[PDB]
Each structure stands twice: as structure tokens, then as C-alpha cells.
Amino acid sequence: SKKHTGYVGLKNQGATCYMNSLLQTLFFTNQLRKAVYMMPTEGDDSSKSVPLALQRVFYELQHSDKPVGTKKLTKSFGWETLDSFMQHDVQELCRVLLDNVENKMKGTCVEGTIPKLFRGKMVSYIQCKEVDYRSDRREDYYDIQLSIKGKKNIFESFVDYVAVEQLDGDNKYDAGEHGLQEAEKGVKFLTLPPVLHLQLMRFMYDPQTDQNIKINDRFEFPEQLPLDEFLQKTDPKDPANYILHAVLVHSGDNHGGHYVVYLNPKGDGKWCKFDDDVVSRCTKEEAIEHNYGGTNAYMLVYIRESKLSEVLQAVTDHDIPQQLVERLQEEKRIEAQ
Ligand SMILES: Nc1cc(-c2cc(Cl)cc3c2O[C@@H](C(=O)N2CCNCC2)C3)ccn1
Numbered sequence: 227s228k229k230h231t232g233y234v235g236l237k238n239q240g241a242t243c244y245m246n247s248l249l250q251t252l253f254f255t256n257q258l259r260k261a262v263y264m265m266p267t268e269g270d271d272s273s274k275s276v277p278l279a280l281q282r283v284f285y286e287l288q289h290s291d292k293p294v295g296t297k298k299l300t301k302s303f304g305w306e307t308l309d310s311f312m313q314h315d316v317q318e319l320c321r322v323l324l325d326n327v328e329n330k331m332k333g334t335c336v337e338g339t340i341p342k343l344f345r346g347k348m349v350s351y352i353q354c355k356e357v358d359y360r361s362d363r364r365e366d367y368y369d370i371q372l373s374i375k376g377k378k379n380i381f382e383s384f385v386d387y388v389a390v391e392q393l394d395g396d397n398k399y400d401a402g403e404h405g406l407q408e409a410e411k412g413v414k415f416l417t418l419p420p421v422l423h424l425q426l427m428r429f430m431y432d433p434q435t436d437q438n439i440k441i442n443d444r445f446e447f448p449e450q451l452p453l454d455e456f457l458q459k460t461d462p463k464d465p466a467n468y469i470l471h472a473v474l475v476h477s478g479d480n481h482g483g484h485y486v487v488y489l490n491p492k493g494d495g496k497w498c499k500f501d502d503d504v505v506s507r508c509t510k511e512e513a514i515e516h517n518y519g520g521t522n523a524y525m526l527v528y529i530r531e532s533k534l535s536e537v538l539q540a541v542t543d544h545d546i547p548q549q550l551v552e553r554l555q556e557e558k559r560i561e562a563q
Contacts, residue, residue, distance in 0.1 A: 227505065228291045233491065235293040235503035236283075240482070242296060243311040244474065247487035248319055249296070250500050251472045251527055253287050254491040255421055257537050258327075261339040263546045265330045272557070276302040276326040285546060285554050293503040312481060316474065316525050317369045317425050324368070343537065344368045344423065347416040349458070352399060355408045359401050364416075369423040375430055379446040380526075383426075384456050388413055414458045418466050420533035424526045440480055444520030447473075449495075449510070451528055464532050469493055472527035475517050488513035493534050 228234045236246040253259060263285075267278045279299040286294040300306055303322055305314075328340040345366050352361040372383040391411040393399045399409035428441045453466040460466070473488040487500045488508065497513040499506050517523045529537050 231498050231505050231507055233498060233500070233505045234287055234290050235500065235505045236287075237293045237295045238502045239296060239300075241306075241308045241311065242300065243308075244316045244476075244485050245296060245300070245311070245319065246502055247474045247485050247500070247525075248316055248323075249283060250287075250487050250489060251474065251525075252320075252323070253284055254472070254489055255343065255527075255537065256539050256541050258339065258343060258421075259284055259288075259541055260539070260545050261331065261336045262327060263550060264334065264336045265327065266334060267330070268549065268553075273298070274302055276323070277330040278302075280323060280327065281550060282554060282557075285550070288541065288543070288546075315425070317371070317423065320423065321368070340368075341366075343421045344419050346419045346422075349414045349416060351412055351414070352393070353410045353412075354399065354401055354404070355410065357401065357404050357407050359404055359407070368419075369425060371425045371427055373430075374426050374428065374443060374445045375441055377445065380424070380448065380451060384453065388415070388456055415453075415456050416458060418453055418457070418468075418530070420530045420537050421471075422468055422528040422530070424528065426524055426526065428522060428524055442519060442522060444518050445523070446518050447514070447523065447526055449514060467531040468528035469531055469534060470514065470526065471529045472525075473513055473517055473523050474525035474527075475521060475523050477521045488517065491538070493529060493538050 236249060239246070262277075262280055265277050265281065267275060267281060270278050272278070276299070279302040283294060283296060283299055303326070305311060311319075324340050324344070331337050331339055345368055348365050348367060350363045350365060354360070370387070372380065373386050374383060377383050377386060389412070393409040393411055398406040399411075401407040401409070426445060429438060430441065432439050447470070449470050451468040451470070453468060454460045457466060471490050471493060475486045475488065477484045477486070488497060489500055490497055490513070495510060497508050497510055499508040499512065
């Protein structure tokens with residue numbers, strides 16, 4: 227309900243699984259929201275336009291007192307059934323949403339907003355021990371998948387993410403003309419984005435048991451996350467200290483269950499629980515400490531301390547172009563009549 231917390235829910239759809247959790251998360255990434263409103267969607271069709279459909283949901287979440295529907299948005303990228311959401315991860319849905327937007331924002335004042343907010347950089351190397359050969363590949367990433375099995379916390383997950391793997395014995399590195407060689411494999415972070423999307427791997431295929439198992443283990447994530455020690459080169463002027471913004475939680479059975487997101491929208495430590503149509507205030511401990519598990523958190527969103535004021539900049543009704551408002555209201559008039 228809007229009068230309590232000032233924020234509005236999304237309509238209850240069991241088929242959509244984790245979409246409402248993602249939509250709310252992306253909606254309260256305010257710099258993206260402003261950016262999404264400026265997309266030149268005039269020419270796009272009312273039914274099959276994902277950028278327009280995201281504009282509608284965002285517009286409605288900003289203005290509506292009643293809960294917001296997502297039926298038009300689901301129809302725009304063709305994930306109508308339950309099976310569609312079941313055979314995709316949350317990061318993949320986010321890729322589908324942000325690609326459409328990123329492509330629409332090309333050739334505009336808002337170009338490069340997605341990579342500005344989300345794109346970091348890393349290096350993957352393979353270094354041979356006893357022979358002079360190295361293989362560096364630079365990669366962009368818009369999200370990080372973290373390992374949690376036998377890991378107490380995020381710090382240990384980042385330790386494991388950058389940990390050097392030893393390619394030796396039966397798993398020796400095929401080094402081309404040099405042949406089978408003992409080698410070291412590893413990953414190093416060059417940059418970390420303003421908005422950091424961390425997915426926690428709670429579904430590892432087990433080799434010994436020979437079955438996909440869910441992981442219900444306790445996993446601790448902090449309100450503040452320093453990441454300088456995991457960068458190759460630290461900047462004194464801009465340290466990589468991050469603030470917890472969102473916690474996407476799942477409960478109950480796999481293949482149905484119940485999805486909730488917890489959010490810290492203004493970055494000010496004042497938490498709200500977004501349970502589909504019901505938005506309500508909650509404690510830090512309900513959002514953070516009580517979702518450690520051992521009910522499990524699967525995605526976490528951190529925002530960089532230095533970029534917080536820009537990323538969560540105040541949106542108003544004036545930051546939506548009139549042409550878009552006129553269009554969306556003209557739809558709302560016809561639907562009601
Ligand atoms: N990264 C990620 C994880 C989940 C997720 C997390 C937990 Cl702890 C339990 C469930 C989840 O989704 C159900 C499931 O098993 N799915 C089969 C694989 N794809 C997703 C749907 C149940 C959902 C979305 N994105």
C-alpha cells in the first residue's frame with residue numbers, strides 16, 4: 227500500500243517468479259529510471275515493444291496508488307508461461323531487459339547508461355609454469371556469479387573468485403605447439419561498476435552425487451562491502467567501498483515457491499520489504515541478518531559509495547517527457563472506458 231511507505235507494489239503473478247523482484251530493484255536504480263524515460267519510443271508499437279513496456283511499468287510504479295500490472299511487459303519479450311521463467315536465471319532476464327534498453331538508447335543523449343551503471347572489466351589469464359607462454363583475455367561483465375558452498379561470506383566468495391587454480395596432473399593445460407604443460411589459471415578485477423549485481427550460486431551441479439542440488443547454507447553479506455583488495459590497481463581518490471541496496475530472496479519449494487525483494491531505495495539504511503502487491507517497512511536485520519539462512523538470498527545489489535548520490539538521484543514527475551506521459555495516459559483512458 228502506497229500511503230504507508232510511499233512505494234507501490236506489483237500485482238501478484240505466480241508465473242512471473244522473480245520478475246517483480248528484479249523490476250523493483252531496477253526501478254529504484256534511479257539513474258536507469260530517468261534514462262529509461264528519455265528513450266525515443268514514439269515510433270514503437272504498443273504491444274511488442276520491450277523499452278515502451280518497461281517505461282509503462284516504471285511510469286505506473288512512480289504514479290499509481292494501486293498495484294502495477296506486468297501483463298503487457300511479459301507479452302513484449304515472450305515469457306508468458308511459467309516454464310519460460312523456470313528455464314532462465316534472474317541475470318538472464320536482466321540481460322534481456324537491459325539489452326533492449328541499451329539498444330534503444332544508442333544515438334541519444336542517454337547512450338551508454340547501461341555500461342556506465344553496470345559494466346565492469348576483468349582479466350582472465352593462463353600462465354604456464356615451466357614454459358614461457360601466457361594467454362590474457364580481457365572481458366567485460368555486467369554481473370558476477372559468486373560461489374557459496376563452504377563459504378561463510380561474500381569476502382570468502384571474492385577470495386575464491388580471484389583464487390589461482392592449478393592446472394596439473396590429469397588436468398594439464400594444452401599449450402598448442404608446446405603441448406601438455408603445468409600451468410596456473412586465474413581471474414583479476416580491473417574495475418567494478420557503480421551498480422554491482424552479485425548472484426549467489428545456490429544451484430551447483432554435483433559431480434560425485436551426479437545431480438543438481440540446491441544449497442540452503444548460511445551465507446553472510448554485509449551492509450558495507452570493501453573490494454579494494456580484489457582489484458589489481460586501487461585508486462586513492464575513489465576506493466571500492468560499496469553499500470547494500472537490494473536483497474532478492476526466495477522461500478519454499480523450488481519450481482514454485484515465493485519470491486520477495488528487500489530494498490534500501492534512498493541508500494539511507496531505511497529498509498522496505500516488497501512482497502508483490504504489499505510494500506511494508508522493516509528492520510535492517512529483517513532485510514540483511516535474517517536472510518542469511520540456515521529462506522535464502524540469491525541476488526544482491528550493491529552500490530558504490532562514491533557513486534551513490536548520482537545513482538540514486540531524485541526522480542520527479544517532471545523527469546518523464548510529456549510526449550510519453552500523454553501516450554501512457556491515452557492508453558489509461560481507453561482501458562478505463
Ligand atoms: N539466479 C537465480 C536464482 C533463483 C532461485 C534461487 C533460489 Cl534460492 C531458489 C529458486 C530459484 O529459482 C527457482 C529455480 O529452481 N529455478 C530453476 C533454475 N532457474 C531459476 C528457476 C527456485 C531465481 C532466479 N535467479
